[PDB]
Design a binder for this molecule. Structure first.
Ligand SMILES: C[C@H]1NCCC[C@@H]1Nc1ncc(C(N)=O)c2sc(-c3ccccc3)cc12
Length: 253
């Protein structure tokens, strides 16, 4: 493989675009200097259209190479116009695909714990794929669930129970982050810096002050679904089987 260019760079390491010397086949290579062992272990379990395909891995010295399907459409983050978002049919289409991916992971007892537009890739046909399983874990062993207690994710995307409870159910945490992603796609704005009564924007949402931004930019139909997902009590929060039945979710656009 010839490393053509950087696709992403950070504290975690880097992602390179690699093109095959003879075939001209393009793949993405995640290069990490030794967590990653768990990322590899989780990746080996996955097989679905709405998850970044894992080809395999190779360790050279103390550096890990993860061979992944190349997603030429880039991050969902870059499709979100600041303070605008994107057209409602596009947001709906990406939300459907996001839900399909999350259903798949939850079905095999895996929680992502880092759902955000920067961790959602688009392929050459604009198909959405869940990416970066470095914070992911097993929450169900054999029809038997375990509660989680890890402080994973970026505060604007995290569910409020992470700040309140000693331990919590895995699935409502991913459902909440998907709701934040949906808000960002529809209005191009994160609704609150923190999911706490101490954050004015969070208190405003709980008080139903939807004449304020970002809610004033969102249509009544997706707003009604957002009112069901962004529920503080994880026990009262909408489950994915009920999201699949929502009026806006099933509205042809
Ligand atoms: C998704 C991002 N989450 C934070 C860590 C970095 C990560 N970046 C990437 N990871 C993997 C791939 C892949 N599997 O193809 C790609 S592709 C790409 C891209 C393509 C086109 C334009 C602009 C960017 C970025 C990227």
């Amino acid at each position: 493989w010839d490393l053509v260019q950087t696709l992403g760079e950070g504290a975690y390491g880097e992602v390179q675009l690699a093109v095959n010397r003879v075939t001209e086949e393009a793949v993405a290579v995640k290069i990490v200097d030794m967590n990653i062992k768990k990322e590899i272990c989780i990746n080996k379990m996955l097989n679905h259209e709405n998850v970044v395909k894992f080809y395999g891995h190779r360790r050279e010295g103390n550096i890990q190479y993860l061979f992944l399907e190349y997603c030429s459409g880039g991050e969902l983050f870059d499709r979100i116009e600041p303070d605008i978002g994107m057209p409602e049919p596009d947001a709906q289409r990406f939300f459907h695909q996001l839900m399909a991916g999350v259903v798949y992971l939850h079905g095999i007892g895996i929680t992502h714990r880092d759902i955000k537009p920067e961790n959602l890739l688009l392929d050459e046909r604009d198909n959405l794929k869940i990416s970066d399983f470095g914070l992911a874990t097993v929450f169900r062993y054999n029809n038997r669930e375990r509660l989680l207690n890890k402080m994973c994710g970026t505060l604007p995307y995290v569910a409020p129970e992470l700040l309140k409870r000693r331990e919590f159910h895995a699935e409502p945490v991913d459902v909440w982050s998907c709701g934040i992603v949906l808000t960002a796609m529809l209005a191009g704005e994160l609704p609150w810096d923190q999911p706490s009564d101490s954050c004015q924007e969070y208190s405003d949402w709980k008080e139903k002050k939807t004449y304020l931004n970002p809610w004033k930019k969102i249509d009544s139909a997706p707003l009604a679904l957002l009112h069901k997902i962004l529920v503080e009590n994880p026990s009262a929060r909408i489950t994915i089987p009920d999201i699949k039945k929502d009026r806006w979710y099933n509205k042809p656009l």
